[PDB]
Amino acid sequence: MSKIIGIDLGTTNSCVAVLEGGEVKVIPNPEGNRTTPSVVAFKNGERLVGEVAKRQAITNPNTIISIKRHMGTDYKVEIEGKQYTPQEISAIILQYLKSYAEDYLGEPVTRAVITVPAYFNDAQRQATKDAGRIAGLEVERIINEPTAAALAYGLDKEEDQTILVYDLGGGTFDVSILELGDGVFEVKATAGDNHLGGDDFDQVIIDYLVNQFKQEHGIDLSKDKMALQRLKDAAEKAKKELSGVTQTQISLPFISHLEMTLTRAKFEELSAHLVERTMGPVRQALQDAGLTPADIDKVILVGGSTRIPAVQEAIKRELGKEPHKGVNPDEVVAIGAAIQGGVIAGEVKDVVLLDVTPLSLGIETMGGVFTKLIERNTTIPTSKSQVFTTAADNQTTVDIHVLQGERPMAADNKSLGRFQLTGIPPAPRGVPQIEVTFDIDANGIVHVRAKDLGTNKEQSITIKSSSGLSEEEIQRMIKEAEENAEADRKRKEAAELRNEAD
Amino acid sequence: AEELAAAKAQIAELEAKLSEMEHRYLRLYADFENFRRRTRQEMEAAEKYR
Amino acid sequence: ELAAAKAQIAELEAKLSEMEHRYLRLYADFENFRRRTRQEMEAAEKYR
């Protein structure tokens, strides 16, 4: 069949994502971009879309810029050769997103699902399923951005609860307060700002910057756009640094040159003003629902520019606790769209347990030198097989001794099995083949086979405990291999290839 | 009479669960079997562009 | 027919065990790929 593919459009924030196996996945675009964005164009006989449409936008008649404002509206653009509607333009947004998810996977997604606003209603949120199928990719449902990343993470193990989201758009802010219906999502409250965000942040950097340069040399900045580009970029840098890092600087030099030591608390007192343009939307929610800041079970951080400690130092002292950061917020809508995408048309209830292997398992070479087949950490329902040969010419029989641990030595390891095998045909050493499939089930009793080839006479063993014991005892040994740190001196028996006599 | 009915009753529930069984049951396959091909180009992309 | 109903019932429960197994070995192999690949691309981009 087909997997149900996420596509969010966030008006300058947009993604089409998927799920392969047991791990949630954020697709790559045709551009080197982890995500290519929402706006486009046209020309004679040939369309141009994305980050490739958008810089032919200040250079050519056709650019559409953040059409989110016209979804569910009677808005009609007059454009060359036919006027156009939000639907037919978005049909191409997702026609291009279709070819791109296709040129990534190869296993097509016809069925797909969308990320809309929590505020939207019968008019526009229908416009989503509709234009969703305009490009050709059917919609099996339409999520809302907020209930979406809520279920990217997911709330349904847990109990009847309450929450408020954080949407940070591309220069838009939002938050939507939600509750649990013990399996049901209904978004309760809505708030935010029409223009506020990351680019604005970059422009407070560019602003105090340019103003300070007119403060020194008297010479003004904004007249110059490779300089100002230089600004946007380097200032974006200093930004996300101030987020993570404790100190900064910016090397912008050979300007025309500004080399500054970029500060954090100056950028903070720079930015600590619009953090209360948020507390407004937030508490306006707190009243739209009626329940105080103290009424909620969990709350979250979303968006692109949300990665700085500004809002989070405004919150830890606002609502009492820390946010769930367990995402990579930037794309966090996309994957969310497909979570249930694969909860519907696909996999059901999931243990995903005994996904790890106690130790590296191997056996008795050259009088005890221990070689691994199984490593540690390995998903348990598996088996690996290897074939040795003759110790010495005419081995009439071969005993098998297997170890568990790391240290490449015999009693420097745990004796696991000892059992033997006889009747081998007499003949030069190294030649005859004996196989051992370590056959490891899921449940923990391990089977292990050794059998000649030319014989097809076979002895195997079914062990019992494999462990029988506790965590500390093992990890004390996992420690022990490290602790020894070169008992590797047994390369001494590695030169015992003296065994070769010729 | 009613003694007859539980036959395709149980049978029903069973193949019924089965359908899904099958589906999901090769889902994993098809996908992993895709991204082996994925990483299969990923060495090709790191061969120049890394 | 009569208990051949029960017979197929058996067949299918059996393919339940059989099936789930067929899966968990899958989960095994899938999740397992990662250690390897991660380290493979490690060595890919240290040099070159």
**DSSP-derived secondary structure letter, A430:** T
Question: H or E stretch including A124?
Answer: helix A124-134
Q: Which of A3, A4, A18, A20 to mutate to test the interface with B (most CBs of B within 10 A)?
A: A20
Q: How far is B50 from chain C (nearest CA, A)?
A: 7
359-398 in A: which are within 8 Å (CB) of C?
A: 375, 377-382
Homologous superfamily, domain A158-196+272-329: ATPase, nucleotide binding domain (3.30.420.40)
- Integer Cα distance of A436 and A384 in angstroms: 8
CATH of A1-157+330-352, one of 3.30.420.40, 1.10.240.10, 3.30.300.30, 3.40.190.290: 3.30.420.40
Give contacts of B42 with chain C, Cβ < 8 Å.
41
Q: Do the chains contact at B27 and A347, CB–CB below 8 Å?
A: yes
Asked if residues A345 and A140 have their Cβ atoms less than 8 Å apart, the reply is: yes
Q: How far is A22 from chain C (nearest CA, A)?
A: 8
- Integer Cα distance of A289 and A295 in angstroms: 10
Q: Which fold has domain A197-271?
A: Actin; Chain A, domain 4 (3.90.640)
Give contacts of A3 with chain B, Cβ < 8 Å.
27, 31
Of C27, C33, C45, the CB nearest to B46: C45
**Dihedral, CA atoms, A409, A412, A418, A423, nearest 10 degrees?**
20
- Integer Cα distance of A189 and A175 in angstroms: 8
Name every residue whose Cβ is closer than 8 Å to that of residue A489 and which is 6 or more positions away in sequence.
none
Helix (H, G, I), strand (E, B) or coil at A163: strand
Homologous superfamily, domain A353-497: Substrate Binding Domain Of DNAk; Chain A, domain 1 (2.60.34.10)
Name every residue whose Cβ is closer than 8 Å to that of residue A383 and which is 6 or more positions away in sequence.
A437, A438, A439, A440, A447
> DSSP assignment of B2-13, as one string?
HHHHHHHHHHHH
Breaks (C-N over 2.5 A) in chain B follow: none
Q: Single out the residue of A153, A148, A173 nearest to residue A282, CA to CA.
A: A173
Beta-carbon count within 10 A of A330 CB: 19
Method: X-ray
Cα distances (angstroms) measured from residue A267 to each of A4, A203, A207, A216: 43, 12, 12, 19
**DSSP-derived secondary structure letter, A166:** -
Name every residue whose Cβ is closer than 8 Å to that of residue A224 and which is 6 or more positions away in sequence.
A256
From the candidates A8, A200, A241, A330, which is the catalytic residue? A8
The dihedrals phi and psi of A369, each to the nearest 5 degrees, come to: -55, 130
* Domain ranges (residues) in chain A: 1-157+330-352, 158-196+272-329, 197-271, 353-497
Residue A80 annotated as catalytic: no
Residue A167 annotated as catalytic: yes
From the candidates A3, A54, A68, A98, which is the catalytic residue? A68
Cα distances (angstroms) measured from residue A263 to each of A245, A249, A269, A502: 10, 7, 10, 74
Tokens (6 digits) for A449: 């086979």
Cα distances (angstroms) measured from residue A232 to each of A202, A219, A320: 6, 19, 35
Beta-carbon count within 10 A of A329 CB: 19
A1-157+330-352 shares its CATH topology with A158-196+272-329: yes
Residue A68 annotated as catalytic: yes
Give contacts of C41 with chain B, Cβ < 8 Å.
42, 46
> DSSP assignment of A233-294, as one string?
HHHHHHHHHHHH-S---EE--S----EE---SHHHHHHHSSGGGTTHHHHHHHHHHH---GG
> DSSP assignment of A439-498, as one string?
EE-SSSPEEEEEEESSS--EEEEE-S-S--S-HHHHHHHHHHHHHHS--GGGGGTTSGGG
The dihedrals phi and psi of A177, each to the nearest 5 degrees, come to: -75, 130
**DSSP-derived secondary structure letter, A424:** P
Cα distances (angstroms) measured from residue A361 to each of A172, A358, A372, A384: 55, 9, 5, 10
Name every residue whose Cβ is closer than 8 Å to that of residue B18 and which is 6 or more positions away in sequence.
C12, C15
> Resolution, in Å, please?
4.1
Give contacts of C18 with chain B, Cβ < 8 Å.
none
Read off the amino acid at residue B43: M
Of B27, B32, B37, the CB nearest to A346: B27
- Integer Cα distance of A29 and A35 in angstroms: 6
